[PDB]
Design a protein around this ligand. Structure first.
Ligand SMILES: [Mg+2]
Ligand SMILES: [Mg+2]
Ligand SMILES: [Mg+2]
Ligand SMILES: [Mg+2]
Length: 133
RNA sequence: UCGACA
DNA sequence: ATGTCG
């Protein structure tokens, strides 16, 4: 129905897909950028979306914040729930970095608890997510 | 054979 | 185009 303004919004930007991937997290209310990841040379959109949610979980947990996280990504939301990023991206020397990060994000999920609700941003009703590039 | 989310 | 799920 309506936007939970007291929340963190995450989004991915890329150049190519697969291509250069980055992400950021913003306060949904103020649009202030709370974190921004250095570009990863090769990755997929969905891997970037996954890393952005997991990074948001880590960021909120460290700050003892109970705010929900908004993502526009059906795929990444499911991967986080499963603790398993089911990417098709070839795992080789060029994709080594993104895959290491993905493996580490999954490992964090398997060693930590969180209560953060992970919520689907309703683009069709609300327009583009605020963490949008 | 599609329907969605990016 | 390409990455993904239902
Ligand atoms: Mg997105
Ligand atoms: Mg990262
Ligand atoms: Mg930590
Ligand atoms: Mg976007």
């Amino acid at each position: 129905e309506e936007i939970i303004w007291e929340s963190l919004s995450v989004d991915v930007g890329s150049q190519g897909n697969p291509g250069i991937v980055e992400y950021k997290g913003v306060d949904t209310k103020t649009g202030e950028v709370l974190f921004e990841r250095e570009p990863i040379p090769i990755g997929t959109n969905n891997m970037g979306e996954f890393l952005a949610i997991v990074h948001g979980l880590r960021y909120l947990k460290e700050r003892n914040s109970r705010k929900p996280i908004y993502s526009n990504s059906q795929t990444a939301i499911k991967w986080v729930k499963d603790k398993k990023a089911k990417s098709t991206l070839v795992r080789n020397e060029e994709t080594a970095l993104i895959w290491k990060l993905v493996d580490e994000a999954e490992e964090w999920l398997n060693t930590h608890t969180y209560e953060t609700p992970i919520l689907k941003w309703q683009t069709d009703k609300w327009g583009e997510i605020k963490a949008d590039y």
